Design a protein around this ligand. Structure first.
Ligand code: CL
Length: 352
């Protein structure tokens, strides 16, 4: 039942909604969910393409914007920023009630900037300013350029959602870049206590990529095993003396965010990823249908840290079979950028 969302909160995990649309906000639905266990919102270009195509409340906004001398991209941004700002205002009470630790809404920069650190910084700074809300995060793909940009944006005091992570190595590089940005601010005597960063580490896409050629003992196991090991990396990084010195001065840890947590194979229980990845100081962003399933028949237990030994043994067998999870991760990141760019192009065409 719905109290499962407060049980998960008590176990230390935030549940966010992996969807956004004009009607979600205008109807009052988002506000009601913020009172009843949902703590934040994520978007991406695929989510906006579907929203723009399906939600009748955009039609008049598009008609209005087609009266103006604006590029399709700016028409998109006007729409998307307005949805995000409004969602931020819905989430603000929640955000303030936790000292700015929850209640965030994420907006992604243009996918075509993904390998351009400067351009990414410039767009992220602009979108942060355009939204004009303390509880907005700018979402940036975790390419090498993205991690360069992360360090700059953190040093600028901007909260960031680093996305399309599939790699423990690339996640650790992101933590080190965050720590450099924080340290720069502390040395400059600047505030860091409200800067928040999440690392959106994708789940179902790993299983989708591998399962058809894995032996049955490993099917549906790899993504969770990778996440479990990533969380152990996280504990080790952030408890080390180097970070503890920053946290003592008010720095926030980055938090892992489980993304792509809808189940994509009907052979697996639809609550598999939410049920399996609950642990303290994490986020899980879930699509509507998965939130529904979790409320109906999910389980709230501290599962993320259970059976780490077996996670590691399975990752050892994945390697034994010849699957290089770093190669896989890079491929998945590149495919995810291509797909987001496809979605973005599809969104823009009706705005010409
Ligand atoms: Cl995303």
């Amino acid at each position: 039942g719905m109290t499962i969302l407060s049980d998960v909160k008590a176990l230390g995990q935030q549940i966010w909604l992996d969807n956004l649309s004009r009607s979600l906000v205008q109807s009052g639905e988002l506000a009601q969910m913020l009172k009843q266990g949902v703590c934040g919102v994520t978007s991406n270009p695929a989510i906006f393409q579907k929203a723009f195509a399906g939600d009748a409340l955009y039609a008049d906004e598009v008609a209005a914007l087609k009266r103006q001398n604006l590029s399709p991209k700016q028409r998109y941004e006007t729409m998307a920023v307005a949805d995000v700002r409004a969602a931020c205002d819905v989430c603000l009470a929640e955000h303030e009630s936790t000292g700015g630790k929850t209640g965030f809404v994420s907006l992604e920069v243009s996918p075509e900037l993904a390998k351009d650190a400067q351009g990414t910084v410039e767009e992220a700074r602009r979108l942060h300013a355009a939204i004009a809300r303390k509880n907005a995060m700018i979402k940036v793909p975790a390419t090498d350029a993205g991690i360069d940009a992360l360090e700059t944006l953190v040093s600028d005091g901007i909260s960031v959602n680093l996305t399309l992570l599939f790699s423990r190595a690339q996640t650790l590089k992101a933590y080190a870049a965050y720590a450099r940005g924080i340290a720069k601010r502390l040395a400059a005597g600047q505030s860091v206590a409200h800067i928040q960063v999440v690392a959106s580490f994708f789940i179902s896409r790993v299983d989708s990529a591998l399962d058809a050629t894995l032996p049955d003992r490993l099917k549906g196991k790899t993504a969770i095993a990778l996440a479990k090991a990533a969380y152990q990396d996280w504990e080790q990084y952030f408890t080390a003396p180097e970070f503890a010195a920053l946290e003592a001065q008010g720095a926030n840890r980055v938090q892992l965010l489980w993304a792509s947590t809808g189940v994509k194979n009907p052979a697996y229980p639809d609550t598999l990823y939410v049920d399996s990845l609950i642990g303290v100081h994490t986020v899980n962003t879930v699509p509507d249908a998965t939130l529904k399933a979790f409320i109906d028949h999910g389980t709230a237990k501290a599962t993320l840290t259970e059976s780490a030994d077996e996670a590691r043994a399975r990752l050892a067998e994945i390697a034994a079979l010849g699957i290089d999870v770093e190669t896989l991760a890079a491929r998945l990141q590149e495919d995810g950028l291509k797909q987001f760019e496809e979605a973005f192009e599809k969104l823009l065409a009706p705005l010409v």
